[PDB]
Design an enzyme around this catalytic site. Structure first.
Site, short mmCIF file in Angstrom:
data_model
loop_
_atom_site.label_atom_id
_atom_site.label_comp_id
_atom_site.label_asym_id
_atom_site.label_seq_id
_atom_site.Cartn_x
_atom_site.Cartn_y
_atom_site.Cartn_z
N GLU B 44 38.97 -23.41 23.04
CA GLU B 44 38.83 -22.60 21.72
C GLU B 44 39.00 -24.36 20.80
OE1 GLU B 44 38.70 -20.21 19.06
OE2 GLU B 44 38.72 -18.23 20.88
N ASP B 73 36.27 -16.93 15.14
CA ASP B 73 36.66 -18.17 15.15
C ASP B 73 37.11 -18.69 13.97
OD1 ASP B 73 38.64 -16.63 16.95
OD2 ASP B 73 37.02 -17.79 18.41
N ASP B 89 31.89 -17.19 17.59
CA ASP B 89 33.24 -16.44 17.99
C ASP B 89 33.30 -17.76 19.62
OD1 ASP B 89 35.32 -14.60 17.37
OD2 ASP B 89 34.70 -13.89 18.68
N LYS B 91 33.65 -17.06 23.55
CA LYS B 91 34.35 -16.38 24.24
C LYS B 91 34.56 -17.38 25.79
CE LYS B 91 33.63 -12.30 22.30
NZ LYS B 91 35.62 -12.23 22.25
#
Lengths: 244, 244
Positions: B44, B73, B89, B91
């Site tokens: 991330e 995100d 996002d 993952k």
DNA sequence: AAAGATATCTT
DNA sequence: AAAGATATCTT
């Protein structure tokens, strides 16, 4: 002792170092984000070296889980004392202001405490202590973190996602509360109090035996709990009634 | 396009950089652990500056959640077109050996897809795209060396908790499957396939509308799904008969 | 409070 | 597979 040495090492290390980013093998530094999702990970990693150093100094082997949803974070034990294992779990939470009340989720109440081998590295009965290393950080007011990278020369210019951090080590049962910490994920909730209370261990249970009995018989929904008990007072009345 | 540039940048960055630890402002480095809870956070953070850099080049504003537990995100949008937002996002999942089948949890199916403003930064209808940046790493066994701190002059010596890392960018609906990715936390499951199928987009839904309809009417338990549908074939038959 | 969100895994 | 674990938060 191991416990006192670990507590001293935790205060010291935390007071001396402030994590500010993740670094690549090539020397490029990426800043941290604001959410506890990021910070619990950072505090887990920050603690591993400390725990292992102190444990070695006392002749304790340190083991981390193999399966990813297995408690605890660290299992400590001497090869000669297999049934005297110590479980250590690192828990994180935040405060917006320094003197607010905090609370922690202290693990599931339907897994290893009800089934000796469920989601635990070693059978629950082999552990003689369950310690919680709790980190409490104060979120910074700015909701906007840095979105650029840095190099080693700029370490002092990297904004930190927290304003301050406090840590403590305490036995799980001592800081356990009587209200669930989560619903669908059935977690034990801690007391809702100030940092000082966790340090001094001002809990609500009279013993670890009571803490365990309470959580082993706690019902999942208030509907089911209404005919049993919803708090410590009601639990004690339930014992008087003959556990019915 | 924004999309082609973003994936070229992610693919490039991933090949030239390897994250190996967190660093403190004092210059002490702490190694990484081997589980997804840790690597998910690292990927991330690794992605943030890249996404922001490419977004700015195309005139998009990048916004991260102001509140925890809010999807996505990253929210990208041009100031001149607030109702054409893009959701990104990140993952992560692991593999024990390269080229095995993988699967991802793709977010809840009872929050923003059923209630326009639930757990989402901006109302769901203001997003025209939902992109998933997926990271797949081959897990590596933790060694004793990862339990000590390091210095800046030792960057190349720190052992990494992953053997290889692959990254892809794809629309959520395209890689969405027909089986849940989690039970109590009601998550959409992705297709269970090899990495190339995610890159190529070899999913099961014909359109994003079929994807949305399927998950908006998917029941939470197999007992409730018994008389409705448990997979894409049964869903299509159910649609054929008039949703009864 | 209690219930159900956030991400991902295991058997 | 489905169901329920891992940690923590919000409404």
């Amino acid at each position: 002792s191991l416990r006192s040495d670990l507590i001293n090492a935790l205060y010291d290390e935390n007071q001396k170092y402030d994590v500010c980013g993740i670094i690549s093998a090539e020397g490029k530094i990426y800043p941290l984000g604001s959410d506890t999702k990021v910070l619990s990970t950072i505090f887990e990693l920050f603690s591993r070296p400390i725990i292992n150093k102190i444990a070695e100094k006392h002749g304790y082997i340190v083991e981390e889980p193999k399966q990813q949803n297995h408690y605890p974070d660290f299992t400590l034990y001497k090869p000669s004392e297999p049934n005297k294992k110590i479980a250590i779990d690192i828990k994180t939470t935040y405060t917006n202001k320094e003197n607010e009340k905090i609370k922690f989720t202290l693990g599931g109440y339907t897994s290893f405490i009800r089934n000796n081998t469920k989601n635990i590295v070693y059978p629950f009965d082999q552990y003689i202590a369950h310690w919680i290393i709790g980190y409490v950080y104060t979120r910074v007011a700015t909701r906007k973190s840095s979105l650029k990278t840095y190099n080693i020369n700029e370490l002092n210019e990297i904004p930190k996602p927290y304003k301050g951090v406090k840590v403590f080590l305490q036995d799980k049962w001592v800081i356990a509360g009587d209200l669930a910490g989560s619903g669908n994920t059935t977690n034990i909730g801690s007391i809702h109090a100030h940092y000082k209370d966790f340090v001094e261990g001002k809990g609500i249970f009279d013993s670890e035996d009571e803490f365990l009995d309470y959580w082993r018989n706690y019902e999942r929904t208030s509907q089911l709990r209404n005919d049993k008990y919803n708090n410590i007072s009601e639990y004690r009345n339930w014992i008087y009634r003959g556990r019915k």
